């Protein structure tokens, strides 16, 4: 058998987009502009613009719904105590700083800085951008409230009223959740705190150095930009007509036979708008799927402890921290990783007094001379007794059973 003898606290970063830019379009300016004749001709092509406006409004409300479901998950707004001491844990890099006017953590400020006349030109073509319903300040307040709740109460506030508990006790509970006894933490508190602080500093430095971690979010923004660019380029295409300017067509051609070019231009512009709307719908569906995944991760990893493998970061998940980023969320997963493994000799059961003994939760190991029982996730040998082992059957059906003795706690003092 192989059993680890040391542990390491690790911190990982995972970025998920939540919402995209809300956009609106105007038919009159983009398709016609300022010419009344074009609109008068457009009036009898149906209600395509109504469908486009309805779809855009649906996307706009869907973005706000996604943001609200992702972030607005707590009824109360918890406040951190003025005394910032948690038994050696720092949490300085994630707690809000009142000195800065933006009321954001250093990690949040770095995230904002790492993420980045054309606006007026796009507005002049009827393409406008609606501001988000929720401002960054309220998102920061939600993140701060979530952090305060998960620090001062653990997972108790995710199922009802918030219940206070010392942070070392909460981390002992978290270790007990993954099958590690509490005395492991209670004998290595300082080392665990130092490792956590070092990991937090390493994450801070890594996020400061390389800016390619958030490219995903940037990519999404880039996509939106290029989409708009394409639409602008669609205003420079004749689609096989004589010119892209209405006044020249109306002046250089006799109007009874000049209607064909105008109709061709209208059809081309409507087709381009429909293609853009379809692409926006597909992108919005993908963003909604990502937002649902992010909301599920927020509900599970942050508000509780998840036993799912690799769901909340590599290794044995311990806890998580949420942070906000421009059009996205960042999860800092704190997990547990074994290390410094050692070889040992193991047997399925112990034969004593013609009976087979099996461990309750531990595993039997041997160092070449003696036999002990130890927990499966950490090396802690103990003398085999009757309290941690149970008897089931005899020694003639079990394969690989070995011979040893089991100490009886009550027999020594019985005689004296």
């Amino acid at each position: 058998i192989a059993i680890p003898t040391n542990f390491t606290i690790s911190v990982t970063t995972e970025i998920l987009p939540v919402s995209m830019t809300k956009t609106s379009v105007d038919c009159t300016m983009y398709i016609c502009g300022d010419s009344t004749e074009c609109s008068n001709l457009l009036l009898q092509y149906g209600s395509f613009c109504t469908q486009l406006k309805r779809a855009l409004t649906g996307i706009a409300v869907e973005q706000d719904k996604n943001t609200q479901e992702v972030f607005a998950q707590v009824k109360q707004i918890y406040k951190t105590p003025p005394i910032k001491y948690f038994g050696g844990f720092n949490f300085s890099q994630i707690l809000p700083d009142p000195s800065k006017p933006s009321k954001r953590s250093p990690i949040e400020d770095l995230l904002f800085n790492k993420v980045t006349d054309l606006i007026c030109a796009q507005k002049f073509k009827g393409l406008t951008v609606l501001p988000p319903l929720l401002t960054d300040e309220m998102i920061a307040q939600y993140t701060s409230a979530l952090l305060a709740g998960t620090i001062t109460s653990g997972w108790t506030f995710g199922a009802g009223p918030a219940l206070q508990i010392p942070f070392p006790m909460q981390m002992a509970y978290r270790f007990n959740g993954i099958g590690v006894t509490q005395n492991v933490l209670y004998e290595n508190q300082k080392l665990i705190a130092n490792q956590f602080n070092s990991a937090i500093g390493k994450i801070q430095d890594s996020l400061s150095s390389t800016p390619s971690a958030l490219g995903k979010l940037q990519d999404v923004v880039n996509h939106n930009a290029q989409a708009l660019n394409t639409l602008v380029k669609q205003l420079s295409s004749k689609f096989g007509a004589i010119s892209s300017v209405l006044n020249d067509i109306f002046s250089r051609l006799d109007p009874p036979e000049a209607e064909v070019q105008i109709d061709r231009l209208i059809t081309g512009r409507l087709q381009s708008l429909q293609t853009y709307v379809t692409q926006q719908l597909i992108r919005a569906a993908e963003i909604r799927a990502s937002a649902n995944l992010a909301a599920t991760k927020m509900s599970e990893c942050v508000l509780g402890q998840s036993k799912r493998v690799d769901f909340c970061g590599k290794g044995y998940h311990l806890m998580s921290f949420p942070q906000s980023a421009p059009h996205g969320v960042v999860f800092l997963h704190v997990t547990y990783v074994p290390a410094q493994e050692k070889n040992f000799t193991t047997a399925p059961a112990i034969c004593h007094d013609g009976k087979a003994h099996f461990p309750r939760e531990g595993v039997f190991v041997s160092n070449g001379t003696h036999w002990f029982v130890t927990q499966r996730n950490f090396y802690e040998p103990q003398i085999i007794t009757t309290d941690n082992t149970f008897v089931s059957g005899n020694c003639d059906v079990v394969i690989g059973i070995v011979n040893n003795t089991v100490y009886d706690p009550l027999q020594p003092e019985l005689d004296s």
């Binding site: 918890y78 501001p131 319903l133 939600y142």
Partner: protein, 86 residues
């Protein structure tokens, strides 16, 4: 949308695409927000849950007398009595 509340077209007799339905000023007050210029509603210093989302943290609702606008409230403030051994 996109008006600084001062360039609002007051019109003379007919210079707008709007078919003469403009409310000028000082009747229902003027509010300036990031989304645009809002008229017909009176801003208040209180805070309630969002009913009609306007944008940029501004919402509107009809009380029982008129339509008013305010800033949405995130929730009720709460505090946890953290301690060394409690």
């Amino acid at each position: 949308q996109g008006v600084n509340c001062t360039e609002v077209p007051v019109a003379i007799h007919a210079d707008q695409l709007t078919p003469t339905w403009r409310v000028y000023s000082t009747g229902s007050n003027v509010f300036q927000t990031r989304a645009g210029c809002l008229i017909g509603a009176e801003y208040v210093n209180n805070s309630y849950e969002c009913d009609i989302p306007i944008g940029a943290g501004i919402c509107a609702s009809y009380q029982t007398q008129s339509i008013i606008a305010y800033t949405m409230s995130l929730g009720a403030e709460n505090s946890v009595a953290y301690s060394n051994n409690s």
